[PDB]
């Protein structure tokens, strides 16, 4: 597994600093490559290290725009992207590679950059409430940026959850909502909660849906 | 430098049917420093095939690729419903500059689905803010195809309601649909009954979907 730090807004101007965390230690025979993804867009590589070294290569549309480094001590690569754009809003993925290879054998998580002129905030959460089966669910309206991650009961329920894509109101502000459908019989009895977490703004809501 | 080339854009195809994409590279890239990644909505890639041809760990069999020089496929012989991503190759012949290809979209077909039509009220709890969200959820159809029309008393309202699709079911191949009607409280509790009504192929006539407000 490779780790990488939490979604992030930077103003337009300023840099940018992303971890990605290798697993156990063993980061020492393979390559770290960091590729980013405009949104609806391609795969765009910036750059690769080899941490053994401390040496890097960089793609030419980043060159001294972006520096990218290890941390031999506590496994950890970062990407530094610097006079950030617009354009740069991306979620940047970290890789692994073998030096003597080259496919991208493993991938982080991802971490989305929002390069905006734009505060923190963090959303409110409501219930949708319940109409053999039924509909109930969670909206959660006006926060910034993205992403915010809904689960249900911890996760113990996954079965039947469409969680949509957010919208840009016309605020600026990110909305969506979190459905599930379960049982009509299990609703006076199975009891539902939504787990909300949007990490830009360490906001963790947990909400009961009743009718 | 080397600029990869992917064919076709978008592969709509049903299941059981074989996809087969293409890459092609604008210099060799020899016996092969090319590799095949999954996309999959809200993931990181996923690796395929490297090599041209050698198949990664956990890769179902239906995968393959095969090529050299210039050209190359990616195959799916079988398709599934599972399958729903997009697929990118990348090469990596010299270590010093990796790129990508723009990727192919791989959709799946299905038989008719209607949509399961709710309603949603806002919570008291936002309504003590001042804003009204009226939720009406078009859930698991096929095909994309829909019309969502809100209806207040029995006029139709336009210009306050978003819609956002989730992507294709993995397992299914359907679609879900929310429409959001966003007003100010005093908008709100101007009319009583709050309609949403669904057009869809799936449906012999349009469902409705109402509650008065309360």
């Known amino acids: 597994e490779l780790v990488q730090s939490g979604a992030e807004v930077k103003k337009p101007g300023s840099s940018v600093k992303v971890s990605c965390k290798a697993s156990?230690?063993?980061?020492?025979?393979?390559?770290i490559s960091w590729v980013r993804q405009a949104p609806g867009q391609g795969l765009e590589w910036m750059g690769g290290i080899i941490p053994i070294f401390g040496t890097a290569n960089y793609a030419q549309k980043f060159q001294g725009r972006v520096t990218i480094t290890a941390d031999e001590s506590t496994s950890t690569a970062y990407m530094e992207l610097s006079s950030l754009r617009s354009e740069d809003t991306a979620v940047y993925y970290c890789a692994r590679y073998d030096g003597i290879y080259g496919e991208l054998d493993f991938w982080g998580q991802g971490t989305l950059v929002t390069v905006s002129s734009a505060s923190t905030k963090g959303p409110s959460v409501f219930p949708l409430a319940p109409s053999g089966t039924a509909a109930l669910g969670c909206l959660v309206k006006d926060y910034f940026p993205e992403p915010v991650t809904v689960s249900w009961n911890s996760g113990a329920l996954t079965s039947g959850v469409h969680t949509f894509p957010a919208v840009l109101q016309s605020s600026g502000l990110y909305s969506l909502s979190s459905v599930v459908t379960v049982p009509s019989s299990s609703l006076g009895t199975q009891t539902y909660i939504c787990n909300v977490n949007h990490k830009p703004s360490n906001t963790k809501v947990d909400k009961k849906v009743e009718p | 430098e080397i600029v990869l080339t992917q064919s076709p854009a978008t592969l709509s195809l049903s299941p059981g049917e074989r996809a087969t994409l293409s890459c092609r590279a604008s210099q060799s890239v020899s016996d092969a420093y090319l590799a095949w990644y999954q996309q999959k909505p809200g993931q990181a890639p996923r690796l395929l095939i490297y090599?041209?041809?050698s198949r990664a760990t956990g890769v179902p069999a239906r995968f393959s690729g095969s090529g050299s020089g210039t050209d190359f496929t990616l195959t799916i012989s079988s398709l599934e419903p599972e399958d729903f991503a997009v697929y990118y190759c990348h090469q990596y012949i010299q270590l010093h500059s990796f790129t990508f290809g723009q990727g192919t979209k791989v959709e799946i077909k299905r038989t008719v689905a209607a949509p399961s039509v709710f309603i949603f009220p806002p919570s008291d709890e936002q309504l003590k803010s001042g804003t009204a969200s009226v939720v009406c959820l078009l859930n698991n159809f096929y095909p994309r195809e829909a019309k969502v029309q809100w209806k207040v008393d029995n006029a139709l309202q336009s210009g306050n309601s978003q819609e956002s699709v989730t992507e294709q079911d993995s397992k299914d191949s359907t679609y879900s649909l929310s429409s959001t009607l966003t007003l100010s409280k005093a908008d709100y509790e101007k009319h009583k009954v709050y309609a949403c009504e669904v057009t869809h192929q799936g449906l012999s006539s349009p469902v409705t979907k109402s509650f008065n407000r309360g």
């Open positions: 156990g230690g063993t980061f020492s025979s393979y390559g």
């Open positions: 090599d041209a041809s």
